[PDB]
């Protein structure tokens, strides 16, 4: 169990050296990296404080070196590390080579409404409207760092997730390093899904305690950067397409 960096090492060690950090922006809600034609994203908080000097240095470095930042206990740095990971795996050509299907022109909660009916479901993270989609059809528990009124604080994971038939976890858990314990707590679910724009589309994760990955393919590189930089007052989803791979 306490080979806990293993899932991080698996992601990093899959990146070929040839890939460089060609572009990097650290916005209020996401960090974003381009390596060639591929763009990856990682989530930030408005709490956490910027690091303009780290940002400058990573330009030019191997993507795999920058991905080492994912392990940082500084969460803005870790978000950059996840952006670098996702610049490799979520490159449209790389993703296609690893068996991800999508168009050059969906939602995991909607996809699994039938499957989770009458079952116990645990969700870690804040997902808009999720209560409306899932609460009427299943026994739903939502766990967050800073819970809204019907929701549980994160320490409740120890108590709740082992009882769950299905578990969904925000990709923010990669950044804050809660993911490995969450995976162990959920290991007897029928299925565990990692969800959000910062999810790596990395089938190696299916060997590391996950059965589904629900992320995001950027189709408009230039636009994705506009949004992350705050130059468009728009959600990141405008710049691409949701994509899901199952084990
Ligand atoms: Cl949260």
Residue numbers in the entry: -2 to 102, 110 to 251
Paper lines:
The final model includes two Dhaf4260 protomers [491 residues; molecule A contains residues 1–102 and 110–251 in addition to three residues from the N-terminal expression and purification tag (residues −2A to 0A), and molecule B contains residues 1–102 and 115–251 and five residues from the N-terminal expression and purification tag (residues −4B to 0B)], six ethylene glycol molecules, four imidazole molecules, two chloride ions and 239 water molecules in the asymmetric unit. Dhaf4260 is a two-domain α+β protein. Size-exclusion chromatography of Dhaf4260 in combination with static light scattering indicates a mixture of oligomerization states, with a tetramer being the predominant quaternary form. However, crystal-packing analysis of the Dhaf4260 structure only supports a monomer or dimer and did not identify any higher order oligomeric state in this crystal form. In addition, the Dhaf4260 pocket is both narrower and longer than in Rossmann-like methyltransferases such as MT0146, suggesting that it catalyzes the modification of a longer substrate or the condensation of two molecules. A chloride ion is present in this cleft in both molecules in the asymmetric unit and is coordinated by the backbone amide of Trp149 and solvent.
The crystal structure of Dhaf4260 from Desulfitobacterium hafniense DCB-2 was determined by single-wavelength anomalous diffraction (SAD) to a resolution of 2.01 Å using the semi-automated high-throughput pipeline of the Joint Center for Structural Genomics (JCSG) as part of the NIGMS Protein Structure Initiative (PSI). This protein structure is the first representative of the PF04016 (DUF364) Pfam family and reveals a novel combination of two well known domains (an enolase N-terminal-like fold followed by a Rossmann-like domain). Structural and bioinformatic analyses reveal partial similarities to Rossmann-like methyltransferases, with residues from the enolase-like fold combining to form a unique active site that is likely to be involved in the condensation or hydrolysis of molecules implicated in the synthesis of flavins, pterins or other siderophores. The genome context of Dhaf4260 and homologs additionally supports a role in heavy-metal chelation.
